[PDB]
Amino acid sequence: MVLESTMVCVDNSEYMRNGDFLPTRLQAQQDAVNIVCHSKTRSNPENNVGLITLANDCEVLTTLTPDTGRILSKLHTVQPKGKITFCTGIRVAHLALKHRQGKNHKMRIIAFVGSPVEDNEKDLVKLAKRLKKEKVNVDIINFGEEEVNTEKLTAFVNTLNGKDGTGSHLVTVPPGPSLADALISSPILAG
Amino acid sequence: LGLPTEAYISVEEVHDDGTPTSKTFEHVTSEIGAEEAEEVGVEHLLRDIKDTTVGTLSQRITNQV
Amino acid sequence: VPGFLQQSQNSGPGQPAVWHRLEELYTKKLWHQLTLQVLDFVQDPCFAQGDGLIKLYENFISEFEHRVNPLSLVEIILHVVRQMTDPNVALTFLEKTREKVKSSDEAVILCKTAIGALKLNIGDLQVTKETIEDVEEMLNNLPGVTSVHSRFYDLSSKYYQTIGNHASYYKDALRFLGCVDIKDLPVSEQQERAFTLGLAGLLGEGVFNFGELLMHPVLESLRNTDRQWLIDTLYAFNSGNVERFQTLKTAWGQQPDLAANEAQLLRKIQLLCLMEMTFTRPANHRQLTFEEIAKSAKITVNEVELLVMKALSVGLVKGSIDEVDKRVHMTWVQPRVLDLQQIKGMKDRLEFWCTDVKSMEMLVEHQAHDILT
């Protein structure tokens, strides 16, 4: 019911080529985000959801929209390539959700990360403090399991919801083959 | 003291030594044009300053200086 | 396959660890890291004579994932083909791998350049030229793919190294060094590369620059004390002094390319001497005399006219000739790189220009004040 504008962050790096997690991990993420978007549409009619693929640098594949058919249609033709850039991805996603169609909506993000991150941790916490000061709620999914833990990643999620923020999550998924959708229950079904 | 717009068209540039081929903007001539309705409206609004003196005064203020 | 790895755990020294890694990955469906370390292992054996068999292993790999930058597949295939010591098998393998990877682009070009490289070693006209010319349009608005362009321009440089067309070699080798913007390569390699590019410049039919080459800030820096003679002659070429060139005949006389090519080099030095004189004389005068040509080029007055006639024809300088008065007017000389001194002269000329402009803008405004208030 709480008007909340999210922006999915599916990844399509070359590390999706792997099938450790159902065929072609990209397929696992595809099904997961598909069910998640349906979940959001059922959360509140005015809610929207977006897709910012974490490709080489980025390409917002579909800006905020209550309708999801465009999200899923753009979700295909996402043959993976290159390596991810976490900082640029979050920054672009933030810039994008600053411009809500309905400014009453609460900003948030949900991330599907399954690659190794190459960035000093300090700048990650810097981007974290900025996102916090701008009142942003991420929900990290440590899919893919390159580190299956803090890949310089925990500090970000503690700072963002630091001081018992209860607004940011880190729902790590192990490499066991079983579509994450079954795994993720709190960030999606009920924060 | 000049036009308010600049136009640019993106083209591939091949170098004799600069080697990698990037895309650079090539400037293209631009100007301002108006249909009769726009001309009427603008000339109406331009009652904040006006000096026509199409004679030598214009061809020496609009240019030379 | 798992038996293949398990029995081949002892193919080479230190290998059981690499076999263990490969087996873990095959048991974990992690094809990208598997590919990266296949590129890792494939390098490790100094001979890798088992690579001719492992390619069957790689062929098994490239069926479930059959992607992971198939450019990487083309690369490992190339490193294996380097082992295969028969032509026809390698060429067929490359063809069928190309058809395999037809759906990536920027990998098929690698296949085509490997294909052409093989036959660069036997017969050229039918295919090599055809191979290159066919693959040219894909290199379209898609830069920063040096990964393949480096190999491209190596092949081009090598093929054009034959026949005798030096100028195309110069162009392609400049472009090759360029696409590899970073050097990170062994010293002897860049040293030989510098030598070849210098000689190509000194022999290219349609390259009279020799000013960007000399200061090419990556090549000429590694010949200052080994074959200096090349840098000496290149400076002689940039400065357009027949005298210094001739006086250095002792140096280049050894090299066969410069040994056979004398008339070409003499005419090039002469053209650059004319260009120097057109660039040294102040703009106001810039009206030479035949006798001065004959004295600064070491040619008789009778044959001077053909020199300038040709210089104009090629496109170095525009102007005319006055046979009656034995003079020549050079209305413009080809642009030439300038150091950080002539830059200051040009800036000072611009200051003079700006001062003049302001002076006379003021004159106009003041004298014309009353009307235009």
Gap between the Cα atoms of A69 and A34, Å rounded: 10
Interface membership of C141 toward B (CB under 8 Å): yes
Secondary structure (3-state) at B34 = coil
Report the greatest alpha carbon distance in chain B. Answer: 55
Based on its alpha-carbon atoms, the radius of gyration of chain C, rounded to whole angstroms, reads 30
Distance from CA of C361 to the nearest CA of B (A): 6
Tokens of C14: 């230190």
- The one-letter code for the residue type at A144 is G
d(CA C134, nearest CA chain A) in Å: 27
Q: Does residue A35 contact residue A93 with C-beta atoms inside 8 Å?
A: no
Interface contact C182, partner B, CB < 8 A: no
In chain C, how many domains are there? 1
Q: Count of CB contacts below 8 A, A vs C?
A: 23
Is residue C40 in some structural domain? yes
Find out whether C107 and C74 touch, Cβ atoms under 8 Å.
yes
Residue C225 lies in a domain: yes
H or E stretch including B9? strand B7-13
Rg (CA), chain B: 20
**A147 DSSP 8-state letter:** S
In-domain check, residue C304: yes
In a domain, C355, yes or no: no
Structure tokens, A174: 């192990």
Across the interface, whether the CB atoms of C69 and A14 are under 8 A apart is answered: yes
Domain presence at residue C351: no
Instruction: Compare all CA atoms of chain B with the CA of C209 and give the residue at the minimum distance.
Output: B16
| Domain-located, residue C370 | no
Which residue stretches of A69-153 are H helix?
A: 69-75, 86-98, 121-133
- Residue C282, both tokens: 């102040």
State how far the Cα of C65 lies from the Cα of C31, in Å rounded to an integer. 7
Domain spans of chain A, in order of start = 3-186
Rounded to whole angstroms, how far apart are CA atoms A171 and A113? 11
Q: Sort A14 into a burial class: Cβ within 10 Å, 0-12 / 13-18 / 19+.
A: buried
CB atoms within 10 A of CB C223: 19
Resolution value (Å, 1 decimal): 2.9
CA-to-CA dists, residue B15 to B19, C94, C179, C211, C215, angstroms: 5, 33, 12, 16, 17
For residues C210 and C203, what is the distance between their CA atoms, to the nearest angstrom?
11
Is C64's CB within 8 Å of A18's CB?
no
Confirm or reject contact between C64 and chain A (CB < 8 A). yes
Q: Is residue C352 part of a domain?
A: no
Inspect the interface and report whether the beta carbons of A18 and C32 lie closer than 8 Å: yes
C56 touches chain A (CB under 8 A): no
C171 is a domain residue:
yes
Method of elucidation: cryo-EM
* Residue C43 structural domain: 1-330
